[PDB]
Structure 1
Amino acid sequence: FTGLSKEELLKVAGSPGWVRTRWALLLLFWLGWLGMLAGAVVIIVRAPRCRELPAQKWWHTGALYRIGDLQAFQGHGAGNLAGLKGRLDYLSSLKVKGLVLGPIHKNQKDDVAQTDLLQIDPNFGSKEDFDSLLQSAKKKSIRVILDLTPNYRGENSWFSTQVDTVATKVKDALEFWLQAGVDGFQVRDIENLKDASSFLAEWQNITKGFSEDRLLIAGTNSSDLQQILSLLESNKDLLLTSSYLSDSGSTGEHTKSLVTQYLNATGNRWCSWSLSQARLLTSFLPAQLLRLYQLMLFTLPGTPVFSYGDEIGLDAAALPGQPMEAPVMLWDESSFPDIPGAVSANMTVKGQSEDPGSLLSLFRRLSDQRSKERSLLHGDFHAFSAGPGLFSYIRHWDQNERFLVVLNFGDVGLSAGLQASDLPASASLPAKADLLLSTQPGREEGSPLELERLKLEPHEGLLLRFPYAA
């Protein structure tokens, strides 16, 4: 209707000169299609397929939670095993993966003949209540680790007379409690054990000989590096919590050396990062360093281990009339019975759980980032040089978003001075990075920050973040 009809087109468009060119156009089309396909395949094979997931276990994903004295976790009277079942929705909010339960077996005193590692104390609960606790945590996806130090009431924790009977009853307790369905064990104070190096290997051989989904944790009180490495001669798959980190530490150039030296001596294995074997952070730290260490322990390459109350900044040296090994947990304001009024509103679980600038509001975001992102999970660690008093490092896995953590353990304000100059071509830092959080209030969240004029306040830590690029 705006051109030729049928018959005029069948007149003009049927001649040589017009049919050869349209067959040439068909030739050009089906030659361009195969050229595009060849270009695509050539682009594909000249690329980087992928890396490898390193086949993680359950204790590689998040943090463990140590509950020492079970009577003081909830309170008097209801200090039993079934009461803890009413608390698992708090722990699942903390996103811990494990639960290092305290020693619950019957131990009177130094009488070896009446310490039975298979019989639960009647003041904690009964076997069916224990199994209900286990299966409820299994439904909540939390694993239960059972401590098994025999003398958990004496001074010498390993029964300072002969060693064969206690070593053979601990060995016998593993093959019963594993059939009960527990997911690991912890043995504390192994420096009070005669020839402990050859005993841990037998228990580790037994524990892995039930499944590869089983754990053994071992705890000392030694800060010696060369004593720690001797425990890890024939044991490589052991978790060894100790007092290696704390000991000192108003400087950050000394903490950087501790972390780098422990990683270099071990051969970059899987380690546990904690401050003690049974004590809280406030026993070694001031209140002005609880956030800097909480940022550090969640980003270092290993498994962080915490005790109960390390998320709320609990302190036994603020309320008198309390033991130093087992403080009371501050659930609500009416918790502590004696001296009615010393407990404050910023000191409890309920008081900090709405304030978005507390300790419990930082622990939740950090445990949210640790168990989720593939850089902090099984990435590579590279710490680099900075100013006088800065600990600065980078986690980078393959192509996920990198993390640059910058910590200032000092008390004076200063610059950053990020002279990297050695970091590899797969992880060299850009000119602009984001900012996921900060330890101190008084910054803005989400903004792309520049790493040349970054200044830092006293006792400040930052969790900047940049994605994979050139």
Structure 2
Amino acid sequence: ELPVQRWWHKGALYRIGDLQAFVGRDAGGIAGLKSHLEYLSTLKVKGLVLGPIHKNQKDEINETDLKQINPTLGSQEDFKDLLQSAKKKSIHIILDLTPNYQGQNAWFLPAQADIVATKMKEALSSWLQDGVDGFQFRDVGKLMNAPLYLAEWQNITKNLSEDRLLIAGTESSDLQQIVNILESTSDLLLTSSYLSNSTFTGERTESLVTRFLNATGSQWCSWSVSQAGLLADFIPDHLLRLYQLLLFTLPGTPVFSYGDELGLQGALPGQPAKAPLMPWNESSIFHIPRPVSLNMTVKGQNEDPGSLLTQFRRLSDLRGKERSLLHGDFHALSSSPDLFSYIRHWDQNERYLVVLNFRDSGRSARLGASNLPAGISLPASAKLLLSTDSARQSREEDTSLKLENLSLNPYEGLLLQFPFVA
């Protein structure tokens, strides 16, 4: 019996930690973000996770004001105007209130926790009256009594409306710490390093995903590779296309950071640790932290049928409109050792079969469905909607493949579709 579907069930979240770096040098952070809403609408993302953007004098709790925007970025009025323009595109806005975000310990000192908590309660009220759709809180492993504070902040948020969302982020990849936070709260999303603490094999990927769902009784969750960092900084280069397919087709809300749709990478370890500039085009002004070529830029990837940006737009469109991906069940198939394969299914809608080859060579799928719920078995063939191999994509798209003899090319991911049979 299906719960009411809230705005975050309908597709991806998109994090913008450093508004000025996202926007560039031509405008101030809040106004400038407003001019990119049309680009963000083309990605079909359902929400933006912003900031933090508040006043925070490093490690000085009494020169930190969670209710005031940093004036370099804009005014309260600019913010309110941003929220209204986003709402005309059906894009919701989450605010990151991590308090000491400019210092080393982002939650101030342990001794200071009750002062933080008093400040935070006042801030949640003020921001919820200004029209935000919810809140994000990062590095929650550095927050004392995190489960208790998160529960309390959740209750204040939900008290106004169940359409308000809370997101927590951790540096941890440890399943037992992750489960402990989730048990303390209800319908909280928790982002983490869980999916990027990996050997990046077929078997390890299967094992990570199935153990997490089993440990949480398959409740609604987020899927991410970090609480903040870029996908191309956490995941091997050969797997960027494959991991995009995975995050879009697992059951739950996928969460990305700005630039993930391009394969952007962040600062190198000799450079200052600063968020990278979003490379709108190949102009010099965008060349921090690395020089960028046309093919690493929004302008370049926008007309390329082979680009990561083109695959993001395609998958995001399908995620927002097909019921089996909106809120379908998940079943893991058995497959050869280098593969992970699974299906998504709702009622009598089109089913989806995902097959992912984690090896640099041709592999037989050997798909098995030995244990499968009444109502669903595998067909003999299925239609190919998408391959990560853009060569095959230009000449086999919308064609049909026999499942029993399915073969994958090196590092290939497949999205296949099959119908309900009466």
- Which TM-score band (shorter chain)? over 0.9
- Pairing of 1:205-224 with structure 2 (within 5 A): 205-224=155-174
Compute the displacement of 1:255 (Å): 1.2
Equivalent of 1:344, from 282, 290, 293?
293
Map 1:328-407; keep pairs closer than 5 Å: 328-336=277-285, 342-407=291-356
Q: Does 1:110 align with 2:59?
A: yes
Could you say which residue in structure 1 is the equivalent of 2:11?
A: 62
Distance in 1 (alpha carbons) for counterparts of 2:132 and 2:267: 35
Change (3 A) 1:322 1:87: farther
Q: CA deviation at 1:323?
A: 4.2
* Counterpart among 424, 427, 451 of residue 376 in structure 2: 427
Q: What does residue 403 of structure 2 align with?
A: 451
Moved more, 331-340 or 79-88: 331-340
Pair 324,459 (structure 1): closer, same or farther in 2 beyond 3 Å: farther
Name the residue aligned to 1:230: 180
SS at match of 2:218: coil
1:277 paired to 2:224: no
Query: Structure 2 matches for 1:28-427, cutoff 5 A?
Result: 53-76=2-25, 78-160=27-109, 161-316=111-266, 323-336=272-285, 342-427=291-376
1:137–1:143 contact (8 Å) kept in structure 2:
yes
Alpha-carbon distance between aligned partners in 2 of 1:339 and 1:155, rounded to the nearest angstrom: 23
Distance 1:365 1:88 in 2: 18
1:306 match: secondary structure = strand
Q: Secondary structure at the match of 2:249?
A: coil
Q: What whole-Å deviation, never above 9, does each CA across 1:168-208 have from its counterpart, x for those lacking one?
A: 11111101100000000001111111111111110011110
Q: Which amino acid aligns with 2:59?
A: D
> 1:196-224: CA deviations, max 9, x gaps?
11111100111101111100001111111
How far apart, CA to CA, are the structure 1 residues paired with 2:382 and 2:190? 35
Match of 1:440 in 2: 389
Q: How far apart, in 1, do the equivalents of 2:73 and 2:288 lie?
A: 27
Distance in 1 of aligned mates of 2:383 and 2:323: 18
Number of residue pairs aligned between Structure 1 and Structure 2:
418
> Matches of 1:288 and 1:370 in 2, distance apart?
24
SS in 2 for 1:404: strand
Cα-Cα RMSD: 1.7
What fraction of aligned residue pairs are identical, expressed as a percent? Answer: 71
TM-score (norm 1): 0.86
> What does the per-residue CA deviation read over 1:379-426, in whole Å, with 9 as the maximum and x for residues that have no partner?
100001100111100001100000000001122221111122222231
| Residues in 2 aligned to 1:291 and 1:208: alpha-carbon distance in whole angstroms | 36
**Contiguous gaps of at least 5 residues in structure 2:** none
Instruction: Work out the CA distance in 2 between the residues paired with 1:466 and 1:456.
Output: 19
The Cα shift of 1:272 comes to: 0.3
Cα contact 1:383–1:393 (8 A) shared by 2: yes
CA drift of 1:121 comes to: 1.0
Quote the Cα distance in structure 2 between the aligned partners of 1:327 and 1:370. Answer: 28
Q: Distance in 2 between matches of 1:234 and 1:125?
A: 36
Partner Cα separation in structure 2 for residue 303 and residue 128 of structure 1? 30
Corresponding residue for residue 45 of structure 1: none
Structure 1 residues 297 and 208, CA, compared in 2 at 3 Å: closer, same or farther? same
Q: State the distance in 2 between where 1:167 and 1:339 align.
A: 37
Question: How far off its partner does 1:347 sit?
Answer: 1.0
Larger Cα-atom Rg: 1
C-alpha deviations, 1:91-121, integer Å up to 9, x for none? Answer: 0000000000111111111111111111111
Structure-2 change in CA distance of 1:322 and 1:97 (3 Å): farther
Structure 1: state its 5+ residue gaps: 1-51
Aligned counterpart, 1:35:
none
CA contact 2:279–2:286 (8 Å) conserved in 1:
no
